[PDB]
Amino acid sequence: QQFGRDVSDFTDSVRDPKTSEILDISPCAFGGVSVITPGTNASSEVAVL
Amino acid sequence: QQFGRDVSDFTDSVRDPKTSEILDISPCAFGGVSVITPGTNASSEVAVLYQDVNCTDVSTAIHADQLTPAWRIYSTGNNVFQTQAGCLIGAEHVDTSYECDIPIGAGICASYHTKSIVAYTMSLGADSSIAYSNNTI
Amino acid sequence: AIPTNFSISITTEVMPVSMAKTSVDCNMYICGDSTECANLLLQYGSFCTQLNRALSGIAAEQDRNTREVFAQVKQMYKTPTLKYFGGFNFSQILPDPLKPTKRSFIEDLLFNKVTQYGECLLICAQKFNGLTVLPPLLTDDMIAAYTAALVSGTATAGWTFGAGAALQIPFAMQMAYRFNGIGVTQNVLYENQKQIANQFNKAISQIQESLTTTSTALGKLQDVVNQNAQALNTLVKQLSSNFGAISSVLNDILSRLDPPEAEVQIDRLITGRLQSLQTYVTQQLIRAAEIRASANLAATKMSECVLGQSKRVDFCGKGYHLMSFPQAAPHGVVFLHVTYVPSQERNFTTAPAICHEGKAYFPREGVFVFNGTSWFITQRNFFSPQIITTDNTFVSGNCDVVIGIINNTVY
Amino acid sequence: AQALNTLVKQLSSNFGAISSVLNDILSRLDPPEAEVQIDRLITGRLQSLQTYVTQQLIRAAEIRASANLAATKMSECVLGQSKRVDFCGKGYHLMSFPQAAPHGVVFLHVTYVPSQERNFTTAPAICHEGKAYFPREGVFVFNGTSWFITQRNFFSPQIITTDNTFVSGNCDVVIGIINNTVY
Numbered sequence: 001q002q003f004g005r006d007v008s009d010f011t012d013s014v015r016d017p018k019t020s021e022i023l024d025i026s027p028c029a030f031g032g033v034s035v036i037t038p039g040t041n042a043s044s045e046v047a048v049l
Numbered sequence: 050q051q052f053g054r055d056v057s058d059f060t061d062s063v064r065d066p067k068t069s070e071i072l073d074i075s076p077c078a079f080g081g082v083s084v085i086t087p088g089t090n091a092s093s094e095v096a097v098l099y100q101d102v103n104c105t106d107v108s109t110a111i112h113a114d115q116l117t118p119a120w121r122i123y124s125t126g127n128n129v130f131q132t133q134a135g136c137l138i139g140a141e142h143v144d145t146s147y148e149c150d151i152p153i154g155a156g157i158c159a160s161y162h163t164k165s166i167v168a169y170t171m172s173l174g175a176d177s178s179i180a181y182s183n184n185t186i
Numbered sequence: 187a188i189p190t191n192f193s194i195s196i197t198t199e200v201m202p203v204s205m206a207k208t209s210v211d212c213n214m215y216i217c218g219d220s221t222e223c224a225n226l227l228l229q230y231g232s233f234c235t236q237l238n239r240a241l242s243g244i245a246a247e248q249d250r251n252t253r254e255v256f257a258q259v260k261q262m263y264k265t266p267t268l269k270y271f272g273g274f275n276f277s278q279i280l281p282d283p284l285k286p287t288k289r290s291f292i293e294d295l296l297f298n299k300v301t302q303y304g305e306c307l308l309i310c311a312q313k314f315n316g317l318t319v320l321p322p323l324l325t326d327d328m329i330a331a332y333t334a335a336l337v338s339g340t341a342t343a344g345w346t347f348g349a350g351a352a353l354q355i356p357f358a359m360q361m362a363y364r365f366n367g368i369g370v371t372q373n374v375l376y377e378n379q380k381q382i383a384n385q386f387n388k389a390i391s392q393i394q395e396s397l398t399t400t401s402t403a404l405g406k407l408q409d410v411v412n413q414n415a416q417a418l419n420t421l422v423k424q425l426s427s428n429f430g431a432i433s434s435v436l437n438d439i440l441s442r443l444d445p446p447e448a449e450v451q452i453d454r455l456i457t458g459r460l461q462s463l464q465t466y467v468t469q470q471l472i473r474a475a476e477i478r479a480s481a482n483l484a485a486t487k488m489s490e491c492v493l494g495q496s497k498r499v500d501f502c503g504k505g506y507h508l509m510s511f512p513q514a515a516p517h518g519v520v521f522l523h524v525t526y527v528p529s530q531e532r533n534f535t536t537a538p539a540i541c542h543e544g545k546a547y548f549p550r551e552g553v554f555v556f557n558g559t560s561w562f563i564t565q566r567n568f569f570s571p572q573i574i575t576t577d578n579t580f581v582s583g584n585c586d587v588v589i590g591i592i593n594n595t596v597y
Numbered sequence: 598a599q600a601l602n603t604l605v606k607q608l609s610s611n612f613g614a615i616s617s618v619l620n621d622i623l624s625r626l627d628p629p630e631a632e633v634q635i636d637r638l639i640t641g642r643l644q645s646l647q648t649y650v651t652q653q654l655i656r657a658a659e660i661r662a663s664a665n666l667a668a669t670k671m672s673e674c675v676l677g678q679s680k681r682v683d684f685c686g687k688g689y690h691l692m693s694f695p696q697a698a699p700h701g702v703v704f705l706h707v708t709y710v711p712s713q714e715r716n717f718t719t720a721p722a723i724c725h726e727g728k729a730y731f732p733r734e735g736v737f738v739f740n741g742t743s744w745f746i747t748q749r750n751f752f753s754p755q756i757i758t759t760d761n762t763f764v765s766g767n768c769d770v771v772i773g774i775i776n777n778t779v780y
């Protein structure tokens with residue numbers, strides 16, 4: 001065996017082709033952003049999530 | 050007029066090109082398949098339901114090996130009973146009534162008694178009568 | 187303004203609780219029995235796995251709606267022999283055992299004013315279109331049996347049948363307690379028990395002649411059939427759409443044209459018919475969410491209105507409801523409404539209290555009505571001169587805290 | 598869950614395009630040819646995506662039926678006492694204990710159930726000294742010994758006095774008037 005899959009068809013972990021160490025793969029980051037504001041009336045600073 | 054069509058728009062009747070005999074064209078029989086099982090912890094036998102079909106053609110095509118799908122190890126056991134839902138094949142017809150456990154349709158339910166899978170008509174509930182007694186409560 | 191003389195009449199309420207369950211095999215709807223369509227079909231993906239999970243999920247819920255409305259009953263009580271309960275003529279409502287129908291006289295006229303796809307009714311025939319309409323779980327004889335055990339058992343047990351064990355009661359003892367619900371005394375039933383019974387006997391006779399003569403009081407049950415008819419025929423006529431191919435025929439495109447001319451126009455008519463199949467699946471899934479609403483108006487008007495008596499205004503009968511009658515019907519429920527409609531009021535003078543001993547005298551029930559001659563206590567649903575005594579009125583405070591007290595005496 | 602496994606398994610579909618991985622379409626095909634085969638994969642992955650929204654959108658309104666049930670069946674049944682027919686259990690509801698469930702609620706309704714019944718002979722009216730007499734609440738109960746009054750949920754005798762007797766109207770009109778002595 002050389003590389004692992006998850007329940008999907010994505011290869012989530014592989015073995016090193018040179019030094020045979022088995023390495024996870026992680027989807028570096030993603031996600032949404034939301035804007036937490038007090039309203040532009042009372043303020044003009046925001047806070048992102 | 051060469052041929053006929055139905056209330057839909059495919060042809061179901063034809064005058065014969067060779068000998069002019071007025072024919073009908075019904076499509077071939079088909080439908081869905083259910084499987085009636087009592088549970089793997091319960092047993093390992095099943096009885097299948099073939100939906101919306103005539104038992105004349107279905108019981109024929111099993112022995113003549115004309116069904117797609119076809120099973121590796123299966124036989125009817127000569128238990129073919131026509132409901133309005135279709136030809137229940139593999140369960141034992143019983144003439145009594147009970148409560149419904151696994152439905153089929155048209156007033157027929159099936160369950161797992163003495164063990165084997167049996168089929169019957171539903172009983173709507175307990176039977177009773179109330180006297181209309183003119184002075185009694 | 188308080189009445190003295192009322193009416194009892196019958197109002198028909200009509201609801202549907204189920205529509206016709208269908209199912210669709212893809213390989214005869216989509217492919218039309220061609221081979222290469224199925225070769226093209228397995229490259230889209232197993233999407234007909236999910237499109238028979240949906241039309242099974244609806245078809246398994248037309249069994250519950252038929253079962254949650256009617257199968258509230260624990261014990262199937264027999265039809266009693268005499269159908270004449272103190273002048274109450276229950277002949278047309280319970281089924282007549284002389285007919286080979288297992289149906290009452292009402293239900294036979296209901297079927298005869300209401301009165302393309304494969305079906306096995308026995309003669310089983312298939313259609314070229316892969317449209318089947320499977321029969322329901324409960325046949326109409328079982329539906330006409332839960333109807334009959336809801337009018338046999340309630341004629342002999344009343345609200346106890348919905349309360350608990352179906353305890354016996356005379357039906358004249360029954361209706362009198364249903365006058366006790368609407369704040370109306372036992373003497374309104376028993377004194378008037380002749381023409382109470384004889385309006386209700388002719389109120390059933392109205393519904394006969396109203397339904398022998400005409401229709402369209404069953405318009406809701408007609409439209410449940412009509413929305414079945416359109417959504418099948420729209421699913422039928424979109425077979426004949428070209429969708430950019432040279433024809434809508436998958437076997438002409440198969441056989442007549444080139445094999446490069448085929449797969450271009452095979453792949454058009456599948457993607458056309460596939461998302462025309464999904465539009466049908468979605469619009470059944472919305473239309474089966476209105477039935478699930480209007481089968482819960484029936485599973486509460488057969489809980490609350492048929493078993494109990496309802497304290498809810500303009501809910502299962504205009505005016506004050508007394509008893510409810512379920513019926514069977516093609517795809518749905520037809521209710522009948524024994525309603526209390528007061529009438530023929532006259533003007534009466536009211537006043538808040540009595541000034542005697544310099545103290546105010548507060549009623550427990552109703553008003554104080556001046557006769558023109560006399561003061562007395564009544565209720566506002568029928569004229570009832572009950573005279574002011576020592577315990578149907580009580581006391582707190584002196585006079586003239588009420589504006590317009592009576593210089594009277596608590597007798 | 599099976600809405601999502603519908604959605605994940607439709608990644609691996611080819612949708613009639615050349616392949617189901619974009620780094621195998623862009624690899625083999627050259628960018629004039631690849632970008633038309635990517636478009637049939639994008640549109641295939643959008644039309645299963647928007648359908649997932651609509652199947653979530655109908656099943657969202659299947660719950661607002663059941664969330665306006667539970668908003669009532671807590672704020673009429675725990676927070677009061679229900680006077681309706683088989684709302685909150687079967688019988689005569691007394692209390693209700695709501696629990697908390699994953700993605701739902703759990704109620705504990707306590708009902709009052711009548712039991713242990715016995716016949717007698719009834720009567721709607723008493724002829725006492727020229728009048729017909731009527732019950733205020735209850736029926737005229739005769740257990741073979743005497744005539745008395747009880748309520749329709751529990752059998753307990755009440756002496757027929759004009760305290761609890763609806764005194765109105767003359768004798769010998771009403772159906773079923775029984776000659777007794779009202780005290």
Ligand SMILES: *[C@@H]1O[C@H](CO)[C@@H](O[C@@H]2O[C@H](CO)[C@@H](O[C@@H]3O[C@H](CO)[C@@H](O)[C@H](O[C@H]4O[C@H](CO)[C@@H](O)[C@H](O)[C@@H]4O)[C@@H]3O)[C@H](O)[C@H]2NC(C)=O)[C@H](O)[C@H]1NC(C)=O
Pocket residue numbers: 103104105106306308309310311
């Ligand atoms: C499933 O398929 C089978 C066969 O494919 C089918 O069984 C057939 O049923 C028909 C009736 O439905 C039978 O036909 C009858 O046969 C008898 C004896 O041969 C005749 O006397 C009958 O004539 C009477 O009926 C005619 C039409 O109603 C009248 O015009 C006439 O005057 C007579 O009154 C009639 O021809 C046939 O014999 C069987 N065949 C077999 C092999 O069983 C079955 O009905 C199908 N079931 C479903 C649900 O589709």
Ligand SMILES: *[C@@H]1O[C@H](CO)[C@@H](O[C@@H]2O[C@H](CO)[C@@H](O[C@@H]3O[C@H](CO)[C@@H](O)[C@H](O)[C@@H]3O)[C@H](O)[C@H]2NC(C)=O)[C@H](O)[C@H]1NC(C)=O
Pocket residue numbers: 191192193381384385530
């Ligand atoms: C109070 O309301 C009731 C019903 O709404 C009225 O009863 C009706 O009384 C009339 C008499 O004026 C009845 O007509 C007679 O009926 C008998 C039947 O035996 C018939 O033989 C006579 O020739 C005559 O037609 C009428 O039938 C009756 N209604 C019903 C439904 O039976 C009553 O008059 C009302 N009282 C007042 C003060 O308005």
Ligand SMILES: *[C@@H]1O[C@H](CO)[C@@H](O[C@@H]2O[C@H](CO)[C@@H](O[C@@H]3O[C@H](CO)[C@@H](O)[C@H](O)[C@@H]3O)[C@H](O)[C@H]2NC(C)=O)[C@H](O)[C@H]1NC(C)=O
Pocket residue numbers: 270275277278291
């Ligand atoms: C309770 O209601 C029923 C209605 O279901 C009443 O039955 C009806 O009775 C009348 C009187 O006999 C029937 O009229 C006669 O019918 C015979 C039958 O053929 C006919 O020969 C006569 O010329 C006449 O038309 C009527 O048909 C009948 N209704 C039904 C549906 O059968 C019944 O009388 C009522 N109860 C009482 C005590 O009145």
Ligand SMILES: *[C@@H]1O[C@H](CO)[C@@H](O[C@@H]2O[C@H](CO)[C@@H](O)[C@H](O)[C@H]2NC(C)=O)[C@H](O)[C@H]1NC(C)=O
Pocket residue numbers: 531532533
């Ligand atoms: C009850 O009172 C109302 C008004 O107090 C009466 O209605 C009036 O009747 C007279 C005839 O007597 C008319 O001239 C008026 O125009 C009516 N007024 C209104 C507002 O309708 C009514 O007739 C009385 N009914 C009874 C039974 O006493």
Ligand SMILES: *[C@@H]1O[C@H](CO)[C@@H](O[C@@H]2O[C@H](CO)[C@@H](O)[C@H](O)[C@H]2NC(C)=O)[C@H](O)[C@H]1NC(C)=O
Pocket residue numbers: 740741742743745754
């Ligand atoms: C019927 O009910 C009455 C009460 O309403 C019962 O009468 C009492 O019975 C007890 C026990 O036998 C006696 O000690 C009392 O003196 C009775 N009181 C009266 C007023 O009769 C009676 O027992 C009941 N009938 C039966 C068969 O139990």
Ligand SMILES: *[C@@H]1O[C@H](CO)[C@@H](O[C@@H]2O[C@H](CO)[C@@H](O)[C@H](O)[C@H]2NC(C)=O)[C@H](O)[C@H]1NC(C)=O
Pocket residue numbers: 724768769776
């Ligand atoms: C209950 O009491 C009434 C009292 O009115 C009885 O009515 C009497 O009936 C008899 C014959 O049955 C007549 O001779 C009397 O003239 C009636 N009384 C009056 C005041 O006229 C009634 O019969 C009694 N119940 C039973 C079943 O006998």
Ligand SMILES: *[C@@H]1O[C@H](CO)[C@@H](O)[C@H](O)[C@H]1NC(C)=O
Pocket residue numbers: 017018019
């Ligand atoms: C390649 O050679 C290095 C040393 O030169 C060794 O550490 C490594 O394991 C080798 N890898 C393979 C795949 O042979």
Ligand SMILES: *[C@@H]1O[C@H](CO)[C@@H](O)[C@H](O)[C@H]1NC(C)=O
Pocket residue numbers: 041042
């Ligand atoms: C804007 O903010 C002020 C105070 O900061 C407040 O009085 C006013 O009502 C707000 N108006 C709107 C439209 O938000």
Ligand SMILES: *[C@@H]1O[C@H](CO)[C@@H](O)[C@H](O)[C@H]1NC(C)=O
Pocket residue numbers: 090
């Ligand atoms: C199988 O059913 C029996 C019935 O009582 C039960 O006791 C048993 O635990 C079940 N098997 C498993 C693995 O749970």
Ligand SMILES: *[C@@H]1O[C@H](CO)[C@@H](O)[C@H](O)[C@H]1NC(C)=O
Pocket residue numbers: 183772773
């Ligand atoms: C019921 O009782 C009333 C009065 O006692 C009587 O007129 C009627 O005939 C009785 N009916 C039956 C069926 O016994």
Ligand SMILES: *[C@@H]1O[C@H](CO)[C@@H](O)[C@H](O)[C@H]1NC(C)=O
Pocket residue numbers: 557558559560571
């Ligand atoms: C009420 O008035 C009517 C007619 O004015 C009269 O016949 C009746 O006896 C009176 N009743 C009382 C209790 O005063």
Ligand SMILES: *[C@@H]1O[C@H](CO)[C@@H](O)[C@H](O)[C@H]1NC(C)=O
Pocket residue numbers: 592593
């Ligand atoms: C009732 O009597 C009191 C005390 O005499 C008096 O003040 C009042 O005016 C009287 N009511 C009317 C309507 O005159």
Ligand SMILES: *[C@@H]1O[C@H](CO)[C@@H](O)[C@H](O)[C@H]1NC(C)=O
Pocket residue numbers: 180182185714715716
């Ligand atoms: C009540 O009466 C009915 C018929 O009158 C009888 O069948 C039943 O056994 C009786 N039950 C009791 C508890 O007396």
